[PDB]
């Protein structure tokens, strides 16, 4: 409690005590630093601290303390400026202007305290946003005048103008009202003519680079908005593209300026603009070739060395070249005197594309896509870039990433496919060459053979079938030879995987050569017995990948075969999968299900299904008989695991067969639900005998896995079913009886959220056919689940998300279920929706807002009937004020758009006279008062109490505009945004809400 002296405003502020706290915070450590931090926050947040800011800026020797003082002052200017006496406003302006003038005079201070000076400049800009130009018309003229008196003042004026341009044009959208932004934008547009003169004079005459760089940094900001004539009707492009590219001080910023110049809005039909656009590109590439590095330089090595700012420069050069060439390269393609410039620019990009830097590669790759796509469709262009595209092929091939990164592979594939169409012969030659260097060992490595295999596999479908046949054969032959050459399981495993990857990428080839396809599959089966790490996973993943694309060739009887190959697979299935892990067996069965679904003869399809499921059905029948005999047998971990793996197998086959799976589901369905009940009892019994901790034990977790996989199986089939009559008449009745009461009557920690998910799917697809079933679902899960999740936002996250998904679908498909709720339960329904508004969890928030929206629509559809009338009397203003609450509290910004839409709907109901009854109590306002008048009256009172620092005029204007605009969502949203700005300050202009006329 020693440093806490400054927090006492009774006595004068002891500057020396302040500088100790500040120094202890920035330069100190540990407890003393932490205690200093809390004291500084409490001092800074004192609503009177700004008054003691003038003291600090004058009599403090610590620049950190002055910085903090300006921060306190900044909070004041931003939020309470208009509330002050006009005396203070003029005073604060005066000693901010003066403080900046003095700091620019002391060259010692001007160079040592750049931070403090930039902070003071920003504080000045905040005052400008409040006062300029209506109460400060002479700022710009006096700024230009003062510039000529001191180089230090002139430089700092460039910093002030930079920050002003940023605050008005770059960061105003969400920090000001639309009207105030437009006001400041127009104000700068008016007085930019003279701003530019000062800037152009400095650039042409000035010598000190610190002033040059600061002027160029402000120019960068101007280019975001200024008219193009200031750039093309002056000599400024000449200065940027020549003078300022030679010195490394100005080079970085100049390059960024020219990048933005390449984005200006220019005529497009003037031929002198095109000359100037060509000219500054020509000058820039010239300066680079002579002053930085030639086009032959190894930029990969330069970037890796990371000397000085080379990395940032090469990044900015990539951005400049790609930006300009994406927009203007046509200007260079027709004139033969511009051909060398065109190809040198692209050769720099080739060199840039070899840098080992993922994010930079993505930038250049995006441009290459832009190029090769244009060469694919635009006539008479590709011959120009023959040598560029040839180099590009090698660059893409050598930097190919793993496909499983996923986004970068797709981008690389797309470019390489285009490049293959442009010259298939050159692509083939590069790949065979690369492969020869893998065989002769000159470039051999696990990484290099993988990269090449991915590249070869990425272009399938681009060659003719005959060329592809010859190419594929050559590749596999070579890869097979490479594998025999290598020794050791590790090497032979890498090459074997790459062999299998390539074949999996060429299904057109496999579909035309059954003999070969058969050999591949049988070889994969051999790999399913190999235990070397990764082999079995590779074999299974290649199996299903090939099947997904060649399934038709497994279901037919191929010539010179006695049976469709699928039958052969199912025969040896036990032997084939004997060495696989369960998850790998399930993939295998899923792959078989893919094939079986290609058989459209029902009798044969069902027979294949029976044969495929033979082993799991026999294991199933056995344990079903053992389970019913000795229920304690389910306490055996091995039995639980066997059961779960049987069900997972059914899920796998059901996932790939969908509606065709129904006959297998019928074989197990009734005994599966009995099993569901039996494991349910055991879970409940374990929790009773050991407590809630039992839910964490492996025993119980194994039991709940059975329940969850049963629900997943049922969910999977119903989601894909075609015969919904059978779903309703056969599946739903037993399912609800098996799951609902169990869920309702378990303690919260034993309830499976998957029950909610499964029910959501039932309602989605057959909800309209089982209204009494939907009612039963709500009764069993609604109140008990709501009580689990309406105490905080953290507990039971899975139940939380599934809960609102379930309510959403019921509100869409069986709204009548909510009309049957007793009034007390319907009130909880409303409470639950609003409760969802207040979640930051997007999953919950988004559904809560959609339910509210669909609920209003449902009520509206009912017309003028008692339930709708009673709904508005009870809950209309609850939804209006709850929507307004999350809209204005700054903790639910992620849902602004859906909050705005819901609010617009609520307001539109009243101003369309869709609410037939009065929303007020007849003693509250004179009879005959319209709901319009009352709604505006209710909202005015609500906002006046929630935001008491607003004037009645602000509130009245905001509501008049919001009401008039409830048919124009974009404008409506703008008015809400303007309101969100005004509530953060005092004295907001009520006329701002007329911005949209």
């Amino acid at each position: 409690g020693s440093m806490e002296g400054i927090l006492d405003f009774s006595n004068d502020l002891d500057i020396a005590l302040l500088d100790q706290v500040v120094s202890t915070f920035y330069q100190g450590s540990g407890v003393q630093q932490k205690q200093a931090q809390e004291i500084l926050t409490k001092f800074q947040d004192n609503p009177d601290a700004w008054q003691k800011a003038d003291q600090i800026l004058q009599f403090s020797t610590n620049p950190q303390s002055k910085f903090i003082a300006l921060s306190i002052l900044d909070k004041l200017i931003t939020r309470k400026w208009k509330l002050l006496p006009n005396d203070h406003r003029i005073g604060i302006r005066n000693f901010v202007v003066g403080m900046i003038i003095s700091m620019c005079q002391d060259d010692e201070v001007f160079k040592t305290q750049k931070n403090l000076i930039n902070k003071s400049d920003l504080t000045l800009v905040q005052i400008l946003k409040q006062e300029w130009p209506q109460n400060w018309p002479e700022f710009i003229p006096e700024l230009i005048g003062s510039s000529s008196s001191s180089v230090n003042v002139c430089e700092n004026n460039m910093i002030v103008l930079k920050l002003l341009s940023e605050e008005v044009f770059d960061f105003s959208a969400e920090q000001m009202t639309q009207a105030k932004a437009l006001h400041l934008k127009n104000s700068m547009s008016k007085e930019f003519e003279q701003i530019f003169k000062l800037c152009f004079q400095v650039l042409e005459q000035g010598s000190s680079s610190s002033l040059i760089v600061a002027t160029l940094e402000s120019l960068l900001r101007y280019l975001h908005w200024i008219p193009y004539r200031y750039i093309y009707e002056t000599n400024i492009l000449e200065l940027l593209s020549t003078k300022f590219m030679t010195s490394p001080d100005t080079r970085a910023i100049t390059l960024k300026c020219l990048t933005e110049v390449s984005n200006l809005k220019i005529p497009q039909d003037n031929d002198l603009i095109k000359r100037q656009t060509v000219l500054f590109f020509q000058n820039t590439l010239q300066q680079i070739a002579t002053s930085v590095m030639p086009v032959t330089a190894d930029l990969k090595a330069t970037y890796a060395n990371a000397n000085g700012n080379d990395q940032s420069f090469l990044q900015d050069l990539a951005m400049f070249l790609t930006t300009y060439l994406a927009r203007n390269r046509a200007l260079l393609e027709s004139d033969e005197s511009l051909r060398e410039l065109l190809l040198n620019a692209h050769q720099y990009l080739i060199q840039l594309s070899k840098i080992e830097e993922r994010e930079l590669f993505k930038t250049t790759l995006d441009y290459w896509h832009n190029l090769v796509a244009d060469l694919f469709y635009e006539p008479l262009k590709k011959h120009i870039y023959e040598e560029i595209c040839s180099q590009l092929r090698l660059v893409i091939i050598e930097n190919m990433v793993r496909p499983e990164t996923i986004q970068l592979y797709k981008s690389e594939r797309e470019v390489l496919v285009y490049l293959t169409h442009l010259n298939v012969i050159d692509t083939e030659e590069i790949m065979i060459s690369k492969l020869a260097r893998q065989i002769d060992g000159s470039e051999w490595s696990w990484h290099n053979i993988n990269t090449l295999s991915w590249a070869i596999g990425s272009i399938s479908g681009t060659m003719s079938e005959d060329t592809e046949k010859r190419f594929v054969v050559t590749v596999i032959k070579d890869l097979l030879g490479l594998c025999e050459q290598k020794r050791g399981k590790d090497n032979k495993a890498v090459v074997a995987s790459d062999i299998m990857y390539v074949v999996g990428q060429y299904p057109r080839f496999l579909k035309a050569h059954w003999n070969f396809l058969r050999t591949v599959i049988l070889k994969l089966f051999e790999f399913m017995h190999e235990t070397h790490e990764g082999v079995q996973d590779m074999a299974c993943d290649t199996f299903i990948k090939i099947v997904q694309k060649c399934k038709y060739h497994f279901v037919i009887q191929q010539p010179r075969e006695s049976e469709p190959f699928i039958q052969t697979i199912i025969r040896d299935i036990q032997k084939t999968t004997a060495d696989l892990q369960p998850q790998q067996v399930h993939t295998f069965y899923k792959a078989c299900g893919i094939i079986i679904s290609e058989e459209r003869s029902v009798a044969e399809r069902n027979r294949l299904l029976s044969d495929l499921m033979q082993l799991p059905n026999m294991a199933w029948d056995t344990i079903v008989e053992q389970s019913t005999a000795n229920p304690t047998l389910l306490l055996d971990s091995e039995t639980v695991k066997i059961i779960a793996n049987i069900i997972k197998t059914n899920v796998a086959v059901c996932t790939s067969m969908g509606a065709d799976f129904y006959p297998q589901l019928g074989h197990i369905y009734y005994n599966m639900l009995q099993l569901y009940r039996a494991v349910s009892s055991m879970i409940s019994a374990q929790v009773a005998a050991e407590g809630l901790i039992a839910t964490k034990t492996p025993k119980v977790r194994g039991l709940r896995t059975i329940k969850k996989e049963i629900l997943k199986l049922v969910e999977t089939y119903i989601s894909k079913a075609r015969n919904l009559d059978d779903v309703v008449k056969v599946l739903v009745e037993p399912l609800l009886n098996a799951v609902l009461e169990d869920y309702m009557n378990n303690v919260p920690d034993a309830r499976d959220a998957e029950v909610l998910n499964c029910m959501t799917t039932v309602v989605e697809k057959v909800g309209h056919m089982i209204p009494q079933g939907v009612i039963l679902i709500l009764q069993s899960v609604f109140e008990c689940t709501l009580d689990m999740i309406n105490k905080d936002f953290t507990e039971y996250p899975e139940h939380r998300v599934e809960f609102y998904k379930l309510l959403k679908v019921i509100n869409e498909k069986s709204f009548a279920a909510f009309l049957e709720l007793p009034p007390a339960a319907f009130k909880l329904f409303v409470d639950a929706i609003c409760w969802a508004f207040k979640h930051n969890n997007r999953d919950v928030e988004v559904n809560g807002l959609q339910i509210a929206l669909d609920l209003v629509k449902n009520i509206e559809r009912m017309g003028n009937v008692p339930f709708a009338n009673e709904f508005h009397k009870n809950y209309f203003f609850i939804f209006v004020s709850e929507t307004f609450f999350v809209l204005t509290d700054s903790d639910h910004k992620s849902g602004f758009s859906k909050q705005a839409l819901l609010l617009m709907k609520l307001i539109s109901l009243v101003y369309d006279n869709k609410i037939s009854v009065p929303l007020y109590q007849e003693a509250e306002v004179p009879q005959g008062t319209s709901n319009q008048v009352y709604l505006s009256q209710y909202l005015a009172n609500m906002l006046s109490n929630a935001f008491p620092h607003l004037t009645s005029e602000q509130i009245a204007s905001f509501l008049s505009a919001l009401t008039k605009q409830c048919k124009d969502l974009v404008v409506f949203k703008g008015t809400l945004r303007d309101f969100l700005v005004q509530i953060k300050e005092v004295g907001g202009d009520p006329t701002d809400y007329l911005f949209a006329e």
Partner: peptide
């Protein structure tokens, strides 16, 4: 060369030796 291919592919050792 198609029969060559399946021949060489069959020789790919399932046990990686």
């Amino acid at each position: 060369s198609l029969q060559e291919l399946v021949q060489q592919f069959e020789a790919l050792p399932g046990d990686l030796v």
